[PDB]
Amino acid sequence: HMSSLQRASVSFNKPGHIPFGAVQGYAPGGVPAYSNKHDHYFSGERNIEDNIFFGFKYQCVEFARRWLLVRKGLLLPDVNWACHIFQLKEVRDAATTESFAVLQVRNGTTTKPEADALLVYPSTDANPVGHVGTITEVGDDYVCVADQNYRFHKWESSCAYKLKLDHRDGIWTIIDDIDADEIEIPLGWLTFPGRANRPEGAPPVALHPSLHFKEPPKPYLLRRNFLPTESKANWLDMNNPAERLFVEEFGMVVSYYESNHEFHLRCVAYGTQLHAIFMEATAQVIESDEKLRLFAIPEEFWPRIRHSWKYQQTYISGRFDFAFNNETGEVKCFEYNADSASTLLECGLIQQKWAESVGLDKQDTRGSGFAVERNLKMAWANSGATGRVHFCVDEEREEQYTALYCMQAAEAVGLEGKLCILFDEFRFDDNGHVVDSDGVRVRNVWKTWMWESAITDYYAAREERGENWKPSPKDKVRLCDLLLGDDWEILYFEPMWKVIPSNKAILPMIYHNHPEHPAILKAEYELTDELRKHGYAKKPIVNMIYQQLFELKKQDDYYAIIGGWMIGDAFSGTGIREDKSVITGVDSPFAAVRIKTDKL
């Protein structure tokens, strides 16, 4: 049956991927494998039951640990990377806690692999953490693997996939060549000699209490002053235009913020959790007329904004503004600026190149925007944009270096980019479609231009041209033609619906829906007695909302506000702007954040 969509509606819930948390299937013994959504996802959420830390929701080591517990009654110890499992000489018995000797068997030897063994993939460029799975079965020319975070389909059988097992000249080699442009060969597998499987349908064992999870340390975000002895004089590459424009706008004992890992996890979980919460509320807003009114969206744009919502469920960037209190441990989110990507480059790149220009870069501390570029290539990869992408900005260096930084990411995943300052790149063709000067019809637009500016330019265009108007090649292309043209299937990065979560009117909605959430401040459409007592700010819609206040603590006399980035659908990094009096966007210093990693 029928569809008006000519180009297919896009989304981040891809085909051949079931949603986060859904069961893909069961390993022999009834061990559930859960979907991690897609292969770059990180929930930041621990899986814990009766004080037993199984691992991170749903990453690969988590399935191994849970599986080994259910299947052989053994507790897999803590390991930084999946690949480090292959160097393990012993695991623990869940009851006695005593050590249990494992046997490392290597791939590509005269030893045939066997079932109920932990298969381990090595560390490599495009899989730098490695991987672990479970051999469930072994045939004459294949093995079967059960795992998490490799394939995201619904399991047909009792394993995620089969893998080739080569046998030549008396040597057995498991090869993973499913995708033959990314062939992979596991180190080998661990076996557990003398420990029989538990009877299928047996209940889960209970663990010795001394094997409970240790409460992790408190999150901290500490301002520190550095003693640099190895300084680089000129550090930003002027050949990379993004770095060049940035230097052209501003200029080339020092200071920074240091977080521990736990603070970083809290941001990943809180940010990811808030993203879902904002999106949910957006659906509420979209399906309600009364609310579209409340958000000051003119009624003439309701069908188009609803189109946007149904058609394009993909997006590239958004930023939460957090405050963090070291004493109380509280993170609180003010605002989700989900439609202007301001300071992506600072957080994504400049921050790290600054650390490298002083000696702050080490093995033990990692820049808080490490994942931005990888998650930004993924964002484009799964965005749904194919073919050319026009990057449209104003005559301001900030927007250009932002655009270019994204264009790089886009181009790295095979999308053709074209940077467009103002609108003289574009012409109307014979049939009234917007085209670029190579004669290519506009398909995908990334932009800094805001939708409110577009709506305003629209109503001007109406008066200045008349309602009877229809475009022709003699007509010049305005902002509204590019964003609010007759072509509604153009993919926009940041889609029109993105104004909804950025509107403060959504704040009471997300409070009412999820008051329990520790990052959410109380917000109302009308002033309550509760708020008169706790403190409040009267914040407008273009009437107004009332939002709880939150003490903003100082360090070395600096106030700090934290920017948390959603790139595509993955929380991807933090950045801090800093001021002794008032943090005021560009005019305030960017501070670099370093995460102190888990040295066991």
Q: How far apart are CA 537 and CA 507, in angstroms?
A: 13
Residue nearest to Cl ion (CB): 55
Secondary structure class of 72 (helix, strand, coil): helix
Closer to Br ion by CB, 22 or 202: give it.
202
**Binding-site partner at residue 202 among Br ion, Cl ion, none, CB < 5 to 8 Å by type:** Br ion
Say which entry of Br ion, Cl ion, none residue 303 contacts (CB below 5 to 8 A, set by partner kind): Cl ion
Q: Decide if 372 contacts 428 (C-beta within 8 A).
A: no
Interface with Br ion by CB under 5 A: which range of 22-30, 160-168, 201-209, 520-528?
201-209
Breaks (C-N over 2.5 A) in the chain follow: 252, 542
| Residues whose CB is less than 8 angstroms from the CB of residue 500 and which lie 6 or more positions away in sequence, other chains included | 282, 285, 286, 295, 506
Residues 357 and 372: their CA atoms lie apart, in Å, by 20
| Contacting range for Cl ion; rule: CB under 5 A; set: 31-39, 303-311, 367-375, 389-397 | 303-311
Picked from Br ion, Cl ion, none, the partner binding residue 123 (CB below 5 to 8 A depending on kind) is: Cl ion
Which residues contact residue 299 at a Cβ distance below 8 angstroms, ignoring those fewer than 6 apart? 292, 293
Helix (H) or strand (E) holding 121: strand 117-121
Binding flag, residue 185, Cl ion (CB under 5 A): no
Asked if 311 and 526 touch (Cβ cutoff 8 Å), the reply is no
Both structure tokens of 108:
């590509």
CA distance 490 to 493: 10
Our finding on whether 538 is near Cl ion (CB under 5 A) is: yes
55 binds Cl ion (CB under 5 A): yes
Query: Crossing angle for the helix pair 397-412 and 241-249, nearest 10 degrees?
Result: 170
Which element (helix H / strand E) includes 480?
helix 479-483
Q: Which of 42, 53, 56, 334 binds Cl ion (CB under 5 A)?
A: 56
Interface residue with Cl ion among 303, 473, 535, 589 (CB under 5 A) is 303
Residues 82-121 that bind Cl ion (CB under 5 A): 83
Closer CB to Cl ion, residue 53 or residue 322?
Answer: 53
C-alpha angle 383/385/388, rounded to 5°?
A: 145
How many residues bind Br ion (CB under 5 A)? The answer is 1
CB of 65 to Cl ion, least distance (A): 8
Instruction: Pick the piece of the chain touching Br ion (CB under 5 A) from 140-148, 198-206, 245-253, 551-559.
Output: 198-206
Strand positions, DSSP E, 317-453? 317-324, 331-337, 365-367, 389-393, 417-421, 426-428, 434-436, 444-447
- As measured in angstroms, the least distance from the Cβ of 47 to Cl ion is 8
Q: Which of 9, 104, 111, 123 binds Cl ion (CB under 5 A)?
A: 123
CA dihedral 475, 480, 482, 485 (to 10 degrees): -90
Nearer Cβ to Cl ion, position 45 or 361? Answer: 45
Binder to Cl ion among 537, 541, 544, 597 (CB under 5 A)?
537
Distance CA 167, CA 111 (A): 11
Contacting residue, 202, 206, 276, 542, with Br ion by CB under 5 A: 202
Closer of 202 and 422 to Br ion (Cβ) = 202
Residues 122, 204, 329, 359: which binds Cl ion (CB under 5 A)? 122
Nearest position to Br ion, beta carbon: 202
Interacting partner of 55 out of Cl ion, Br ion, none (Cβ under 5 to 8 A depending on kind): Cl ion
Between 94 and 268, CB nearer to Br ion: 94
Residues lying near Br ion in the complex (CB under 5 A): 202
Residues engaged in binding Cl ion (CB under 5 A): 7, 55-56, 59, 61-62, 83, 122-123, 302-303, 537-538
